[PDB]
From a paper:
Kemp elimination is a straightforward proton–abstraction reaction that can be performed by a simple molecular machinery consisting, at the bare minimum, of a catalytic base.
Finally, we have used X-ray crystallography to determine the 3D-structures of the catalytically optimized GNCA4-2, GNCA4-12 and GNCA4-19 variants, the first of which has a transition state analogue bound at the de novo active site. These particular structures were chosen as they are all highly active variants, in terms of the measured rates within the available substrate concentration range, with improved catalytic parameters over GNCA4-WT. The protein backbones of these new structures are essentially superimposable with that of the background GNCA4-WT variant and, therefore, the observed enhancement of catalysis is likely linked to small rearrangements in the de novo active site. To assess this, we also performed EVB simulations on the variants for which crystal structures were available: GNCA-2, GNCA-12 and GNCA-19. In the case of GNCA-2, which has the largest deviation between the calculated activation free energies using the crystal and FuncLib structures (ΔΔG‡calc = 2.2 kcal mol–1 with the crystal structure giving better agreement with experiment), we observed subtle structural differences the crystal and FuncLib structures.
Numbering used by the authors:
A (entry chain C), C (entry chain A): 27 to 58, 60 to 238, 240 to 252, 254 to 294
B (entry chain B): 27 to 58, 60 to 238, 240 to 252, 254 to 295
Write the structure that this text describes.
Amino acid sequence: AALSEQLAELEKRSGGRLGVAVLDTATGRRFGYRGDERFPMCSTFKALLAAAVLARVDQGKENLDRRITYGKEDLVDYSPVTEKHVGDGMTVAELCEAAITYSDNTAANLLLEALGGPAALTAFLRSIGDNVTRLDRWEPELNTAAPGDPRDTTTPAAMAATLRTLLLGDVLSPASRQQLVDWLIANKTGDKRLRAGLPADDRVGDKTGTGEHGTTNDIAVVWPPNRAPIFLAVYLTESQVDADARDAVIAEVARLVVAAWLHHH
Amino acid sequence: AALSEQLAELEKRSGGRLGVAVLDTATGRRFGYRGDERFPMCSTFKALLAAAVLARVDQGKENLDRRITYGKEDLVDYSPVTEKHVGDGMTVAELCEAAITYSDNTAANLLLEALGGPAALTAFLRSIGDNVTRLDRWEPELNTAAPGDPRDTTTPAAMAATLRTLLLGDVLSPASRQQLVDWLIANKTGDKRLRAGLPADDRVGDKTGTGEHGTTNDIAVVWPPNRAPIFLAVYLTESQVDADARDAVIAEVARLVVAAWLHHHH
Amino acid sequence: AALSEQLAELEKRSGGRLGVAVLDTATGRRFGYRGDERFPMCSTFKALLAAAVLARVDQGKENLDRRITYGKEDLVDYSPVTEKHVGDGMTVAELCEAAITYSDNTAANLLLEALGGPAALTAFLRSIGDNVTRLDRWEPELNTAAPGDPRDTTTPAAMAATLRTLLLGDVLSPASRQQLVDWLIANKTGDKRLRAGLPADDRVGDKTGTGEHGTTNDIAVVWPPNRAPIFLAVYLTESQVDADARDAVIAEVARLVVAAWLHHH
Ligand SMILES: O=[N+]([O-])c1ccc2nn[nH]c2c1
Ligand SMILES: O=[N+]([O-])c1ccc2nn[nH]c2c1
Ligand SMILES: O=[N+]([O-])c1ccc2nn[nH]c2c1
Ligand code: NA
């Protein structure tokens, strides 16, 4: 219980509530700190969104090259890619890439539309045995992160196990598994979070999330050199420290976890 | 037509709108009084909620032993089992048992979340050919029972038929069928309603519902001695009599239906 | 295209926004004018609603002869058939017939209940590869047609493609496709729109839509003599002319599309 104690101290310093799940596929060994408590997902849901879209592509019900057009009026805030393509539109794949690697919010709304809504995202998760995660609203309202509101939440343990199933299970075809991995590995938004505490020679894919009420999140798949991948889901909400210090909490969680795994071997 | 006249009179004495459906599987014989009209389900939907969960267990997408945790602030009113387990949580199976046999409302929400919400329960019902019943809202709001509002409603006939399909058709595995039976037979909230009016030697499973606007419901599977099961769905809403008197209306429906089915055979 | 320019002028006279898609199954030829912009469906979605009901009949999950009863409080405006059957109810088939050929609004709400609501119609569309069209609301609210609101919209191109798939593809059984076709051919509400501008010896089925903000729509399947069918989806919204002039805009679209198709040869 040393990791547990250090995480509790860290949580105390943050002023908020911190959830952590680790899933090591070399052994099946897990670790949880509030792993079975609900947390607002904010943009971490977008990893699941892209999986759902890829599943439809595997089914022949969707095409990565299909072009979606939209208006200036459709933009919501934090849309650094989609705001550049009002004139020419974007393909389903480009929206996926933008939603994951730049956390583009309009991209995610267009892609929820492609599924038919947040309820369809939730059905896809239920179809793969994640009985926990739920999406309820669109961008930007799904980031309100109100305490005690179960909408648009997951648990760290549920997210970790679902990310595992998606990337290593047979939910997605091999080509779609690789595509999702490649998008996560190319994430541009996460350099001050889990990536920052991880050893530099770890190969990392991640998706961040950020919201109201001091919410800062990050989920990742990590390949240490010559080892099976490890899944790490970290959620922080109700934090009373500023945005930089919240990023550092997440970076510190990776440091703490890595050091804990080191003392297993 | 004598049973229909009797039920018209009892309806007048309830001061509300009464709905009855009977489905005898010995013969397929049916009877309805307003069997075609919508009524607020209130907790009777939980029988269907448990069925949806079990079907996902059948499918390997859900596990009855899967533990679910929650906090004090997730509790809603009428949660006598879930309020005792804020600390250690409950399994899928324990929640379905609390939802059925104690009508626990928070257990029902947690289970709705396990399906993905009211719309997922509705979709389950559409997937077994129930094109009538609909769940729109969560607990406690789905009990508002406002006249003319179709949300969260069924008809007596559709609920009797869906209950028959669930317990005796091939929607559920045989193990899951028996589990749903066992839960309804184990119900603790229905002693003043249909059970009260049925002959003591009948073996009975039921699920009650109770809501605003004087809404008082009960659905049952009933095995008379050496006889095939009969399904009985009874809905009472907009009633102007007090709660013990509404319960007695339901008990009287069971007495009248039993007496009329006797007159069938003899 | 001269046709694109002719439609631009017609659009400008209308003061609103005009969308046109043509899909010719004899040749594969396609034409679009704003074919990829979203437009409020209003009652044109009822052609999709019926198809989704017929799908379930085909699946053994629904019955055309099933009777639905309802009370007088359940009626919404524009229910010329259902208001005559509060006493005795209507069958599913009757309700589809009323929703398509008289654009009965209560009939559409009862059938939407039969599916389980707007999201279940959206899920039907997604299941056949229409990743665009969406239903969100019930009658009468789905007709508000606010500019910029993507609820209850399609695109002219998506709707022409979906209609083609429903009426000619393998989604519906031979009997259900013929039944949908017969209902469209029996439409009573479209005499001043596309039908009015098509040559009199064309065999036509159609579904109209009308809404707030100057919205007037008509989608149609057309069989010219001795020819495979042509799908024609025409949406007009934000128009600044009165209801009769908007109908005449739709008639003129048909005339212009016919003339353009003649001058291909
Ligand atoms: O992601 N991780 O939970 C994790 C665990 C152990 C490690 N060792 N090196 N990188 C690691 C990452
Ligand atoms: O549940 N029943 O409607 C029902 C009908 C006839 C009966 N006879 N004995 N028990 C009976 C129950
Ligand atoms: O519906 N049409 O787009 C259409 C196009 C060309 C035609 N020529 N004859 N009828 C026609 C209908
Ligand atoms: Na009526």
